Amino acid sequence: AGVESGLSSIETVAAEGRGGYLLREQLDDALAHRQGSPAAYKLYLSVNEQRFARGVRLDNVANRFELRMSVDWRLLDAKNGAEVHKGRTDVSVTYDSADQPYAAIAAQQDGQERAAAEAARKIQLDLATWLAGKKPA
Ligand SMILES: [Cl-]
């Protein structure tokens, strides 16, 4: 209850990029932070955007790609900018592309969404564990 109230007090900040945009969108959903709401924490996301835009072709299977989302992140106190928690999250997904360009792009974008969703889930669990420490006994 207070942990869920604490999670939605976290405002996710990302610099220009598809990865940070997708991860921020996923975290705003997972954290339940409503835009315009008061923020107790600022979560800064540093996605390796070049690595995230690159789907790497795999051997053995035709049009199979591996996509990697690497994120360094800092949790700050929204009032004084002190770093109160940090982390590193590395997520990998595969997508099975197609000879057709529309389908090939759809597969890649779905892979990117799935990477961002799993990265969001890993960070949300890490932050919920941190905010759970905050709950009295
Ligand atoms: Cl993590």
Q: Which residues surround ligand 1, an ion (CB under 5 A)?
A: 87, 89, 122, 126
Q: Which amino acid is at 53?
A: A
DSSP 8-34: TTEEEEE-SSHHHHHHHHHHHHHHT--
Length of the chain: 137
Rg (CA), the chain: 17
Tokens 């892979």: give the residue. 111
CA distance 22 to 26: 6
CATH node for 1-137: 3.30.160.150
Method: X-ray
Domains of the chain: which residue ranges?
1-137
Residues 6+ apart with CB under 8 A from 5: none
In contact, 95 and 118? CB cutoff 8 Å: no
Distance from residue 127's CA to the centre of ligand 1 (Å): 9
Distance from residue 88's CA to the centre of ligand 1 (Å): 6
